[PDB]
Recover the amino acids of this structure.
């Protein structure tokens, strides 16, 4: 045993060094590891909402993003929101989906707020189309309805309404084209059409349109907005963009000031009351 103890010793020490470096690699995994009364009543189609004295902050105890935000929205009425970059419109959308964890005030939808509802119900109640679209890999059924609850005629109707049925029928199999993450399988307008098909199948009855205009040709964006208007006669939509005509077509609009907002109900009244200084030439 003494003629050979040395080799066992060396195995021991070298394997110990290796095990230590591998355990140090493992430790970062644990470092990452430590990071119903209104439910039974179906969510109402009445999109009347009211956010009374709202504020929002990004990080705990930092500079506030909003300041004394008070607004109300009537049922079945299209709402627009304006403001420059960093004015707080993306923050307002994220707070409407309570994505910011340092908001103050009470925010409501039909007398209902985020005090007693889990996230799952909070995401089966509103729809949203982001400025950054993506088409994750899979088939068309996996992009339209990843949950897959919706039936085939439903997806076909959502594609026909979204002006996408013809190009879908021109693919192998139909509703089963193997898509790749991003890629070059569809056009930007067709990606936005897929986003609008997601919005169609969501059936939230409340829509949020977070810059469905950026990085889209005007000749296609205008007909896109025309289709989204002719299709959305109900199910109140709140939009945000930097286009003139998009803000012009909305009824209730609130100009985002430096830290606060100033709301206006009638669109044709506020675009000439300021004498075209802060709401018309800015739009």
């Amino acid at each position: 045993y003494a003629l050979m103890v040395s080799n066992y010793l060396n195995w021991m020490v070298r394997n110990l060094a290796d095990m230590e470096i591998q355990l140090g690699a493992v430790k970062r995994i644990h470092a990452l590891l430590k990071t119903p009364s209104l439910i039974p009543k179906n969510w109402p189609d009445q999109g009347k909402i009211q956010i009374q004295n709202l504020s929002v902050r990004y990080d705990s105890s930092l500079k506030p993003v909003l300041k004394h935000v008070n607004a109300l929205i009537s049922p079945g009425q299209k709402i627009g929101i304006c403001g420059r970059t960093g004015s707080g419109k993306s923050s307002f959308s994220l707070a409407f989906f309570r994505m910011v964890d340092m908001f103050e005030g009470r925010i409501i939808i039909d007398g209902i707020d985020i005090a007693k509802l889990p996230l799952h119900t909070l995401r089966s109640r509103l729809s949203i189309i982001l400025q950054d679209p993506v088409l994750f890999s899979g088939t068309i059924r996996f992009n339209l309805d990843p949950e897959k609850k919706c039936s085939d005629s439903t997806l076909w109707e959502a594609l026909e309404i979204a002006q996408l049925k013809l190009v879908v029928k021109a693919l192998p199999g139909g509703l089963d084209a193997i898509i790749t993450e991003g890629g070059e399988n569809f056009s930007q307008g067709q990606r936005q059409l897929f986003c609008l098909a997601r919005a169609f199948v969501r059936k939230t009855s409340i829509f949020i349109m977070d810059e469905a205009t950026a990085s889209i040709d005007m000749a296609t964006e205008n007909i896109l907005q025309k289709v989204v208007m002719t299709a959305f006669a109900d199910r109140t939509v709140v939009t945000i963009a930097h286009r003139v005509h998009t803000i012009l077509s909305a009824d209730l609009v609130m100009v985002l000031k430096r830290g606060a907002i100033l709301e206006f109900d009638k669109p044709e009244t506020l675009l000439s009351q300021k004498d075209s200084v802060f709401a018309s030439f800015v739009r």
User: Anything to note?
Assistant: The beta strands are 49-57, 69-73, 79-81, 102-109, 127-129, 207-210, 237-240, 252-256, 261-264.
